[PDB]
Every structure is written in C-alpha cells, then in structure tokens.
Enzyme design. Structure first.
Site, PDB file in Angstrom:
ATOM      1  N   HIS A  41       0.818  -1.284  -0.026  1.00 35.41           N
ATOM      2  CA  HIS A  41       0.095  -0.146   0.135  1.00 35.41           C
ATOM      3  C   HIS A  41       0.639   1.338   0.014  1.00 35.41           C
ATOM      4  O   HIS A  41       0.695   2.396  -0.157  1.00 35.41           O
ATOM      5  CB  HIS A  41      -0.967  -0.081   1.165  1.00 35.41           C
ATOM      6  CG  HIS A  41      -0.579   0.265   2.438  1.00 35.41           C
ATOM      7  ND1 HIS A  41      -0.273  -1.066   3.450  1.00 35.41           N
ATOM      8  CD2 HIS A  41      -0.187   1.141   3.207  1.00 35.41           C
ATOM      9  CE1 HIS A  41       0.125  -0.627   4.471  1.00 35.41           C
ATOM     10  NE2 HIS A  41       0.188   0.885   4.482  1.00 35.41           N
ATOM     11  N   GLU A  72       0.829  -8.327   0.367  1.00 34.12           N
ATOM     12  CA  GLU A  72       0.952  -7.191   1.075  1.00 34.12           C
ATOM     13  C   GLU A  72       2.429  -6.738   1.415  1.00 34.12           C
ATOM     14  O   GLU A  72       2.805  -5.491   2.097  1.00 34.12           O
ATOM     15  CB  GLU A  72       0.197  -6.639   2.459  1.00 34.12           C
ATOM     16  CG  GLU A  72       0.046  -5.412   2.864  1.00 34.12           C
ATOM     17  CD  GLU A  72      -0.543  -4.561   1.686  1.00 34.12           C
ATOM     18  OE1 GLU A  72      -1.183  -5.100   0.813  1.00 34.12           O
ATOM     19  OE2 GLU A  72      -0.432  -3.293   1.714  1.00 34.12           O
ATOM     20  N   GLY A 146       1.299   5.561  11.117  1.00 29.70           N
ATOM     21  CA  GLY A 146       2.718   5.967  11.389  1.00 29.70           C
ATOM     22  C   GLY A 146       3.468   4.587  11.616  1.00 29.70           C
ATOM     23  O   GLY A 146       4.825   4.771  11.380  1.00 29.70           O
ATOM     24  N   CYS A 148       3.283   1.435   9.625  1.00 30.38           N
ATOM     25  CA  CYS A 148       3.407   0.519   8.572  1.00 30.38           C
ATOM     26  C   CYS A 148       4.681   0.452   8.267  1.00 30.38           C
ATOM     27  O   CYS A 148       5.589   1.673   8.154  1.00 30.38           O
ATOM     28  CB  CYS A 148       2.398   0.945   7.398  1.00 30.38           C
ATOM     29  SG  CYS A 148       0.463   0.610   8.239  1.00 30.38           S
TER      30      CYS A 148
END
Ligand SMILES: CS(=O)(=O)N1CCC(O)CC1
Length: 182
Positions: A41, A72, A146, A148
């Site tokens: 992402h 991911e 904050g 990730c």
C-alpha cells in the site's frame, strides 16, 4: 531493556531506512545488497526518497501467493551506492506462531520507537482494507497510523513487517527466507 529489544535495536541501527512515497513515510527494512521491503500500500513508483535522497527504483514486485492472493509485501531494488548487511539468515523458513515479539519503527514522526507486542498468532487470512490477504501475523497491541513498515522481531528472527490494525490488534505480513533467494 532486555535481549528482545537488543536484537530489535541491532536490526534497526543497520538494516532500516526511512522510505517516502506519495502515500507517506514508511519504515523500510533492507534485507541484502540493494534489496528492501515495504508494505504494498506504499505504492512504490519509479522514484522513491530514501533518508530524504532522491533514489531510482531498479525493480519493484508486489508479492502474491500461488493462490494469486495479496501478501502485502513489495520487494524493492534501490539504485543506492551502498549495500545492506545481509540478514537473510535471520528470516524464518516456514509460517509459524511466535512468543514475545517487538515491533520497531523509525520515521520523522516516530524515531527510535520499540513496542513489546507479546504473543504473535499465525492468523492466516485477513480482509485488509477490503483486500483479501494471506500469511498475516496478529498481535494484541493497539497500533496506530505511522507504524506501517515497522519490523517485527523475536530474539534471533526477523518475522514480518507491520501492514495494518483494527484499533485493538495489529497485523504484519510474514517474511520468509524463500522470498529473497538470488
Ligand atoms: C491501508 S489499508 O486500508 O489497510 N489497505 C491496505 C491494503 C490495500 O489493498 C487496501 C488498503
């Protein structure tokens, strides 16, 4: 404060950079040579900022399992003038549960941040932001925006990168040794 924080610190001090994309600042784990990982992402493009230096992206691959399900994890090869310490021997070979993990973050917003998250469950399937995702680790800590890209470690192992939460639990994508064979 103890041997878990010791191992986490050793990984943060040599194997992390601050990555900035158009979607924000992320903790970015460097694994070997010029190869790093970041949550998919983050939307890596042709140019990324690494510790606020404009850096060409030589390759970026969004990983999916052989069911063609999102993992991911994006693997990024950076046009950087310096190699990472090779930490592939600290990566697990298989999916597993863990005790006593630490989530470590380093950004402009959260420098030198270490969180004892406790027991890590092999959760498996998660609908992450509406995207079916596999190989998810779960921990019972209220993680926040904050974090990730944060690195999940145990003593002696680098097991995942933080990719989301639901306000009470946090979720990481597994790192497996087989993602980084060269
Ligand atoms: C940031 S998020 O909302 O957890 N989510 C990540 C996965 C992506 O496919 C959809 C958005």
């Amino acid at each position: 404060m103890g041997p878990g924080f010791d191992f986490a610190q050793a990984i943060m001090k040599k194997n992390t950079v601050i990555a900035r994309t158009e979607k924000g600042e992320f903790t970015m784990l460097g694994v070997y040579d010029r190869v790093a990982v970041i949550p998919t992402h983050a939307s890596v493009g042709e140019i990324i900022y690494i510790n606020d230096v404009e850096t060409r992206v030589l390759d970026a691959c969004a990983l999916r399992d052989l069911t063609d399900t999102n993992l991911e994890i994006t693997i990024v090869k950076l046009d950087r003038n310096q190699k990472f310490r090779d930490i592939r021997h600290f990566l697990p070979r298989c999916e597993d549960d863990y005790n006593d993990a630490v989530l470590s973050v380093h950004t402009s917003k959260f420098p030198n941040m270490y969180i004892p998250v406790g027991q890590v469950t092999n959760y498996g399937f998660l609908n992450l932001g509406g995207t079916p995702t596999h190989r998810i680790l779960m921990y019972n800590f209220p993680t926040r925006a904050g974090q990730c890209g944060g690195v999940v470690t145990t003593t002696g192992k680098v097991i995942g990168i933080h990719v989301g939460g639901n306000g009470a639990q946090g979720f990481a994508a597994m790192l497996l040794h087989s993602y980084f064979t060269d």
